[PDB]
Design an enzyme around this catalytic site. Sequence first.
Site, mmCIF file in Angstrom:
data_model
loop_
_atom_site.group_PDB
_atom_site.id
_atom_site.type_symbol
_atom_site.label_atom_id
_atom_site.label_comp_id
_atom_site.label_asym_id
_atom_site.label_seq_id
_atom_site.Cartn_x
_atom_site.Cartn_y
_atom_site.Cartn_z
ATOM 1 N N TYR A 134 -46.592 -24.929 -52.649
ATOM 2 C CA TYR A 134 -46.762 -23.990 -53.762
ATOM 3 C C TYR A 134 -47.041 -24.866 -54.987
ATOM 4 O O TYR A 134 -46.119 -25.233 -55.713
ATOM 5 C CB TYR A 134 -45.469 -23.201 -53.990
ATOM 6 C CG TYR A 134 -44.960 -22.427 -52.788
ATOM 7 C CD1 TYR A 134 -45.449 -21.154 -52.492
ATOM 8 C CD2 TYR A 134 -43.954 -22.950 -51.976
ATOM 9 C CE1 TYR A 134 -44.940 -20.414 -51.418
ATOM 10 C CE2 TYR A 134 -43.439 -22.221 -50.899
ATOM 11 C CZ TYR A 134 -43.937 -20.952 -50.631
ATOM 12 O OH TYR A 134 -43.411 -20.215 -49.593
ATOM 13 N N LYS B 109 -53.949 -19.595 -49.364
ATOM 14 C CA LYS B 109 -53.461 -18.283 -48.946
ATOM 15 C C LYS B 109 -53.233 -17.396 -50.163
ATOM 16 O O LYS B 109 -52.767 -17.864 -51.195
ATOM 17 C CB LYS B 109 -52.148 -18.427 -48.170
ATOM 18 C CG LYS B 109 -51.637 -17.109 -47.576
ATOM 19 C CD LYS B 109 -50.386 -17.309 -46.717
ATOM 20 C CE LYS B 109 -49.177 -17.678 -47.558
ATOM 21 N NZ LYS B 109 -47.986 -17.970 -46.711
ATOM 22 N N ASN C 211 -37.465 -21.574 -51.290
ATOM 23 C CA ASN C 211 -37.630 -20.454 -52.213
ATOM 24 C C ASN C 211 -37.624 -19.128 -51.459
ATOM 25 O O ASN C 211 -37.791 -19.094 -50.241
ATOM 26 C CB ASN C 211 -38.964 -20.560 -52.943
ATOM 27 C CG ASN C 211 -40.133 -20.123 -52.073
ATOM 28 O OD1 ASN C 211 -40.593 -20.866 -51.196
ATOM 29 N ND2 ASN C 211 -40.604 -18.898 -52.297
ATOM 30 N N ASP D 39 -38.395 -20.872 -41.207
ATOM 31 C CA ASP D 39 -38.015 -21.826 -42.249
ATOM 32 C C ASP D 39 -36.770 -22.568 -41.788
ATOM 33 O O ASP D 39 -35.682 -21.998 -41.721
ATOM 34 C CB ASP D 39 -37.722 -21.090 -43.561
ATOM 35 C CG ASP D 39 -37.476 -22.041 -44.725
ATOM 36 O OD1 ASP D 39 -36.752 -23.041 -44.539
ATOM 37 O OD2 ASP D 39 -38.006 -21.781 -45.824
ATOM 38 N N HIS E 113 -42.174 -22.187 -43.252
ATOM 39 C CA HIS E 113 -42.177 -21.688 -44.620
ATOM 40 C C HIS E 113 -41.245 -22.665 -45.356
ATOM 41 O O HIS E 113 -40.367 -23.273 -44.732
ATOM 42 C CB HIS E 113 -41.628 -20.253 -44.638
ATOM 43 C CG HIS E 113 -41.120 -19.796 -45.972
ATOM 44 N ND1 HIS E 113 -39.889 -20.173 -46.470
ATOM 45 C CD2 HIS E 113 -41.654 -18.955 -46.891
ATOM 46 C CE1 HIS E 113 -39.687 -19.582 -47.634
ATOM 47 N NE2 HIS E 113 -40.743 -18.838 -47.913
ATOM 48 N N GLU F 133 -46.608 -25.834 -45.782
ATOM 49 C CA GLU F 133 -47.155 -25.023 -46.858
ATOM 50 C C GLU F 133 -46.696 -25.672 -48.158
ATOM 51 O O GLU F 133 -45.692 -26.386 -48.187
ATOM 52 C CB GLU F 133 -46.648 -23.583 -46.801
ATOM 53 C CG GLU F 133 -45.169 -23.405 -47.078
ATOM 54 C CD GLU F 133 -44.758 -21.941 -47.014
ATOM 55 O OE1 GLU F 133 -45.493 -21.151 -46.394
ATOM 56 O OE2 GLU F 133 -43.699 -21.584 -47.565
ATOM 57 N N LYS G 233 -52.060 -13.170 -51.551
ATOM 58 C CA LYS G 233 -51.300 -11.989 -51.181
ATOM 59 C C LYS G 233 -52.195 -10.759 -51.094
ATOM 60 O O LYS G 233 -53.201 -10.664 -51.800
ATOM 61 C CB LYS G 233 -50.198 -11.734 -52.206
ATOM 62 C CG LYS G 233 -49.120 -12.794 -52.242
ATOM 63 C CD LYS G 233 -47.958 -12.343 -53.118
ATOM 64 C CE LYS G 233 -46.711 -13.185 -52.869
ATOM 65 N NZ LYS G 233 -45.519 -12.649 -53.600
ATOM 66 N N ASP H 48 -51.632 -12.781 -46.875
ATOM 67 C CA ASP H 48 -50.233 -12.495 -46.578
ATOM 68 C C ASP H 48 -49.801 -11.114 -47.079
ATOM 69 O O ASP H 48 -49.818 -10.849 -48.286
ATOM 70 C CB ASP H 48 -49.389 -13.566 -47.249
ATOM 71 C CG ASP H 48 -47.957 -13.552 -46.801
ATOM 72 O OD1 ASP H 48 -47.536 -12.629 -46.069
ATOM 73 O OD2 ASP H 48 -47.255 -14.491 -47.201
ATOM 74 N N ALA H 49 -49.386 -10.251 -46.153
ATOM 75 C CA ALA H 49 -48.958 -8.898 -46.500
ATOM 76 C C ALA H 49 -47.475 -8.807 -46.848
ATOM 77 O O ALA H 49 -46.993 -7.746 -47.239
ATOM 78 C CB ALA H 49 -49.285 -7.949 -45.359
ATOM 79 N N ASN H 50 -46.754 -9.913 -46.691
ATOM 80 C CA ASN H 50 -45.332 -9.946 -47.013
ATOM 81 C C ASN H 50 -44.494 -8.854 -46.346
ATOM 82 O O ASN H 50 -43.520 -8.378 -46.929
ATOM 83 C CB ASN H 50 -45.147 -9.881 -48.532
ATOM 84 C CG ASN H 50 -45.729 -11.094 -49.239
ATOM 85 O OD1 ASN H 50 -45.228 -12.203 -49.094
ATOM 86 N ND2 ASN H 50 -46.797 -10.886 -50.001
ATOM 87 N N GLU I 272 -51.057 -12.828 -42.228
ATOM 88 C CA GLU I 272 -49.615 -13.047 -42.181
ATOM 89 C C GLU I 272 -48.644 -11.903 -42.471
ATOM 90 O O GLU I 272 -48.852 -11.092 -43.375
ATOM 91 C CB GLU I 272 -49.284 -14.231 -43.096
ATOM 92 C CG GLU I 272 -47.830 -14.667 -43.102
ATOM 93 C CD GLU I 272 -47.588 -15.838 -44.044
ATOM 94 O OE1 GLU I 272 -48.489 -16.677 -44.222
ATOM 95 O OE2 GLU I 272 -46.487 -15.934 -44.598
ATOM 96 N N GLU J 33 -41.227 -16.293 -41.230
ATOM 97 C CA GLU J 33 -40.483 -16.849 -42.361
ATOM 98 C C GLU J 33 -39.182 -16.091 -42.605
ATOM 99 O O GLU J 33 -38.231 -16.646 -43.159
ATOM 100 C CB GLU J 33 -41.332 -16.825 -43.636
ATOM 101 C CG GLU J 33 -41.250 -15.526 -44.434
ATOM 102 C CD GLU J 33 -42.219 -15.525 -45.600
ATOM 103 O OE1 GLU J 33 -43.427 -15.600 -45.330
ATOM 104 O OE2 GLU J 33 -41.784 -15.459 -46.772
HETATM 105 MG MG LIG Z 1 -45.408 -15.133 -46.186
#
Ligand SMILES: [Mg+2]
Length: 374
Positions: free
Chosen positions: A328, A167, A44, A277, A307, A326, A169, A198-200, A224, A250
Site C-alpha cells: 500500500y 489493484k 491493516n 493474512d 494480505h 501486496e 476497488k 476488489d469487491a471487498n 477479488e 484475507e
Molecule cells: Mg481485498
Amino acid sequence: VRIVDVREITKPISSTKMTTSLVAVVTDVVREGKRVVGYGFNSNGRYGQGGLIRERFASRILEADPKKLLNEAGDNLDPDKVWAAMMINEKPGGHGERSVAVGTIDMAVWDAVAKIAGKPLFRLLAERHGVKANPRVFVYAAGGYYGLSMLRGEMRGYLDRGYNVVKMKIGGAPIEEDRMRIEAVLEEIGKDAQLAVDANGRFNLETGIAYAKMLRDYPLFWYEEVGDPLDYALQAALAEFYPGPMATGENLFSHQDARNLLRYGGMRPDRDWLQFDCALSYGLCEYQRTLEVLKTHGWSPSRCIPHGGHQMSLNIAAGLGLGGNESYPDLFQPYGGFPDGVRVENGHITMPDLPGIGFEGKSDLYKEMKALAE
Ligand SMILES: [Mg+2]
C-alpha cells in the site's frame, strides 16, 4: 534462552479509528553484544489486540517453564512450543480478535528466533523446509479507493514507482460507473501493467454474477473477494461466469477456515489466489498448518499472496515460496513498506540478508520498536 518480558503498546494508525498494536518479546539471549528482542504487529484492516495480549496471552508465555519452550539442542526458542503455550485454555472455534493477538506475538517470536539463529527469517524458513529461498518477491500495489483523472493519476503514480500490477476497488458505485473507472485505468496503464479489482466482500450472488459478466470482457489480473468471506457456495457458483483468476481469503483467520474454502469454494488451483493474512491469522506457526492444508488439497504455496503489506509477509513469501506480496504505497507507515533502500523494479523487490524479519533495516520503523523495548 528465556523470554524475560513481553511489552505492548497500541496507537491509532497514520493517515477511521483503526489501530496498530506493537509487541516486543524480550529474551535473556545476547548476540554480538546486545539483548535479542523480537518485534511484531498487526496488518491493516483489523484493530490492534494489545488488550487481549496483556489480558490473556502475554502472561501465559512468561509463567511458562522456559526449559519447555526450547528446541532439541536447547540453544533457541521453539516457535511452535511458544505458540502452544500461549494458546492454552482456548476453546475451539471463534477465530477472530484472538487470532490477531496471537499473530502479532507470533511475529515477534519468529523475529527473535531468527535473530538468535543469526540469520534472515526467510533464510531460516527455507532451511527448516529443506529448500533454498528466493529473495526476489513479486509485489503489487493495492489502492484505487473511492474523478477518473485522479484515479488514473493514482495508478500512474504506482507505475512510475516500478509496479506492474495494480489493484482498485469496485462495488462502491453503480456497475456501469465502475466499468468507466476500469476502462479509465486500463487506458492509463496500457501495456505497462495489469489491473486487479476488489469487491471487498460486498456482493450477493446476483450482484457478483452481474459484475462477473461486465468484468470478463476485460483482461483483469484477478477479481477479488466477491461476497462474504464464508459464503463458499457463492464463490463456487462464480466459476460458471468468470473463467478469469479470482482471489479471496484475507478475512479467513484459521487453517480450519482455509480448509473449508478449499473444500467448498470451488476455486481453481491453477490460477486463483489465496490471500490469508499470516499476521492476522494466529501467525506463521498457524500459516504453516494452512500450507499443509493446501498440500492436502493439491494446491501449491505459490498460489498464496498474503494480505498485509509489511516485512513479515515479505519474509514468509521469500521463505515459503509464496506467489508474492501486496503493498500500500505511502500508507500505514512506518509499519508498511520495505527495508530502507530497497525499491520496486519491474514489479519485484529483492530481500536483503538482514537478521530476523529485518525491522532494524527500516529506520522509521525500528525507532518505534526500540522505543518500546531494547
Ligand atoms: Mg481485498
